[PDB]
Structure formats: C-alpha cells, structure tokens
Amino acid sequence: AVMVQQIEGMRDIITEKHVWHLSDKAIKNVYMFYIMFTCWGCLYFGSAKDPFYDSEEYRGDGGDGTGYWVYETVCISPFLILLGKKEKNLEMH
C-alpha cells in the first residue's frame, strides 16, 4: 500500500490507497434495514398524536385533507351567508 512518489516540485508523497467498496450483499442489507425503518416509521408515526390535523383549527373550519378546502370554504360560506340573508329577507329581516 506504500508508494513513494517522486515529484520534483515540492516534496515526496507516501500515498496509501485503501481501495474498498461496501460488499454487494451489504448494499442489499442497508436497503433491507432502511425499508424496515420505513415500515416501522410509517406504522408508528401514523399511530401518533398528530397535533395539527386533529384540532378545530384544521378539522373545524374545513379540513377534508385536500388543498382546496380553504377555497371551497371561502367560496361556499359567502354563499351560505347569502342564503341566510335571503332566508332572513323571506321573513322581512
């Protein structure tokens, strides 16, 4: 592993060169354990007290889990107050 390098410029070099590679099997092994960690984490952290998607801040206002519950909320609750306003005018407010 010892190589003495002769370069005229600065100094001599004592390069080691430990050529190595994670065994072919060990790459499958680290994939195996990481799929195990993914499995464990999916199960356990799905079984966790998820503090944002439980409260009346999210599930109360809208909160179906989509990305449009805000927009259908602010597009339907004004129609809800227009409906309530018409039903108010139906009894002469």
| Interface contacts to other proteins, rule CB under 8 A | 1, 3, 5-21, 23-26, 29, 32-33, 36-37, 39-40, 43-44, 46-51, 53-54, 59-64, 69, 74, 77-78, 81
CB of 64 to other proteins, least distance (A): 5
Closer residue to other proteins (CB): 65 or 90: 65
User: Which H helix or E strand runs over 50?
Assistant: none
Q: Are 13 and 4 in contact (CB under 8 A)?
A: yes
Angle among Cα 32, 38, 39 to the nearest 5 degrees reads 90
